[PDB]
Amino acid sequence: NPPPPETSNPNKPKRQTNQLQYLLRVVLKTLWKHQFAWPFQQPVDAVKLNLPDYYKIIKTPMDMGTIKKRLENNYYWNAQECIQDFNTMFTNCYIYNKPGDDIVLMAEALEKLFLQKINELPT
Numbered sequence: 001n002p003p004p005p006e007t008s009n010p011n012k013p014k015r016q017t018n019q020l021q022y023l024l025r026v027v028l029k030t031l032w033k034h035q036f037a038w039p040f041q042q043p044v045d046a047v048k049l050n051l052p053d054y055y056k057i058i059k060t061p062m063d064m065g066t067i068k069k070r071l072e073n074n075y076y077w078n079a080q081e082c083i084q085d086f087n088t089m090f091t092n093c094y095i096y097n098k099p100g101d102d103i104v105l106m107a108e109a110l111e112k113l114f115l116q117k118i119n120e121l122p123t
């Protein structure tokens with residue numbers, strides 16, 4: 001496995017916004033507690049899971065464990081950066097896996113919920 005994505009940025013300034021607070025306390029928390037969250041709570045462990053070619057296929061890995069730590073560490077300056085990371089996580093699943101796969105159905109359920117929660121992101 002590669003190192004996990006960075007979760008801190010020392011050369012960056014930090015802020016908190018209402019949108020960032022919402023992304024952590026509402027969006028991330030709600031997805032985290034979904035019945036299908038567990039495969040998405042940490043980086044894909046291709047060695048342990050014996051996933052052929054995962055990191056040959058997926059060059060931009062992302063997961064909710066990483067997103068959570070980024071939020072907790074005020075890694076994101078712009079809310080969009082966080083939204084993009086969720087989207088990368090879902091897209092990776094669709095790149096690597098096939099229609100009907102259990103992991104795809106799980107991703108789909110999480111994405112649906114994500115969209116519901118981002119729809120209610122405060123202005």
Ligand SMILES: Cc1cc(/N=N/c2ccc(S(=O)(=O)Nc3ccccn3)cc2)c(N)cc1O
Binds near residue numbers: 051
């Ligand atoms: C994001 C992602 C995760 C995957 N698999 N994740 C797993 C996590 C845990 C297990 S397990 O073997 O540790 N636990 C299981 C496996 C099956 C049934 C119940 N528990 C298996 C796959 C997978 N493939 C493809 C993907 O694109």
